Amino acid sequence: KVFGRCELAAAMKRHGLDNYRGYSLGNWVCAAKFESNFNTQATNRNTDGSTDYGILQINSRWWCNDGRTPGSRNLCNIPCSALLSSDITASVNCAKKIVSDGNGMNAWVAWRNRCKGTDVQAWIRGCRL
Ligand SMILES: [Cl-]
Ligand SMILES: [Cl-]
Ligand SMILES: [Cl-]
Ligand SMILES: [Cl-]
Ligand code: NA
Ligand SMILES: [Ru+3]
Incomplete structure (x- = not known):
């Protein structure tokens, strides 16, 4: 599924990401934009x-099993x-565990390079949440 911007913000909010570990919704939406272009099927x-x-381009080395990442968890x-x-x-649910791992949303390199320190509220602007 390719989500709309506000449609994803809403879903993320419903699922407990708004201010999860202190990260406002806009941070999550920004991260998803640059990780996947809001496409759940992205690999x-x-x-x-x-x-x-x-x-959110969650990686198989640590976080999920795909049967093809030697030496992974x-x-x-x-x-x-x-x-x-x-x-x-x-x-x-998996993002919650990753953002709780110690480095916050720096675990997503694209968040750190493209969203961190930017006006992330702009990603949720004008959404009915
Ligand atoms: Cl993901
Ligand atoms: Cl594996
Ligand atoms: Cl943090
Ligand atoms: Cl950018
Ligand atoms: Na794995
Ligand atoms: Ru770790």
Whole structure:
């Protein structure tokens, strides 16, 4: 599913991301924009053989099982395919564990390079939440 901007903001809010670990909704929406262009089916293969899945491009080296990342963990306890669903539950629940890991949203390199320190509220502007 490719989400609309406000449609994703709403879903993320409903799922408990607004100010989760202190990160306002706009941060999450910005991150999803640049990680996946709001497409739940997005995947990207990493040079190390790990793969990133879903709206927030969650990576198989630590967070999900895809059966093809040697030496990896599955800390969210889900198959990586769950991260590609139209239903964002699995991605949101897994994101909560990642953003709780110690580095905040710096775990998403695209957030740090493209959203951190920017006017992120602009991503939720004019949405009925
Ligand atoms: Cl994701
Ligand atoms: Cl694996
Ligand atoms: Cl933090
Ligand atoms: Cl940018
Ligand atoms: Na894994
Ligand atoms: Ru870690």
